[PDB]
Design a protein around this ligand. Structure first.
Ligand SMILES: [Zn+2]
Ligand SMILES: [Zn+2]
Ligand SMILES: [Zn+2]
Ligand SMILES: [Zn+2]
Length: 111
């Protein structure tokens, strides 16, 4: 008479809380509440979400310069300032976007 299905709890607060509410990494397989990581739950982030512990630079693919790593607010992808085109000599205050996101609505929009 025991479920015993407790695991992969929040690596920030260490609590099961809500599973759906919090995202689930694919690499490590951890969970993190939107508040614990101060992330904005979006219909895009959910799909293909990656924790800040596994997420790497899709440009150079080298985990280390986390500090100099910009994190979009939509796609939630990590990109090193120097690994940006153009490059981000410096880091913005708040509200950053990537090229893959800024992509405007252009093309034959189908159903
Ligand atoms: Zn948490
Ligand atoms: Zn992870
Ligand atoms: Zn890089
Ligand atoms: Zn983006």
């Amino acid at each position: 008479g025991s479920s015993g299905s407790s695991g992969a709890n929040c690596a920030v607060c260490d609590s099961p809380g809500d599973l759906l509410d919090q995202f689930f990494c694919t690499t490590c397989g951890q969970h993190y509440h939107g508040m614990c990581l101060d992330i904005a739950v979006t219909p895009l982030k959910r799909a293909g979400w990656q924790c800040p512990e596994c997420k790497v630079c899709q440009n150079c693919k080298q985990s280390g310069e986390d500090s100099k790593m910009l994190v979009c607010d939509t796609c939630d992808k990590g990109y090193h300032t120097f690994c940006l085109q153009p490059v981000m000599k410096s880091v913005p205050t708040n509200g950053w976007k990537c090229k893959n996101c800024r992509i405007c609505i252009s093309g034959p929009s189908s159903g």
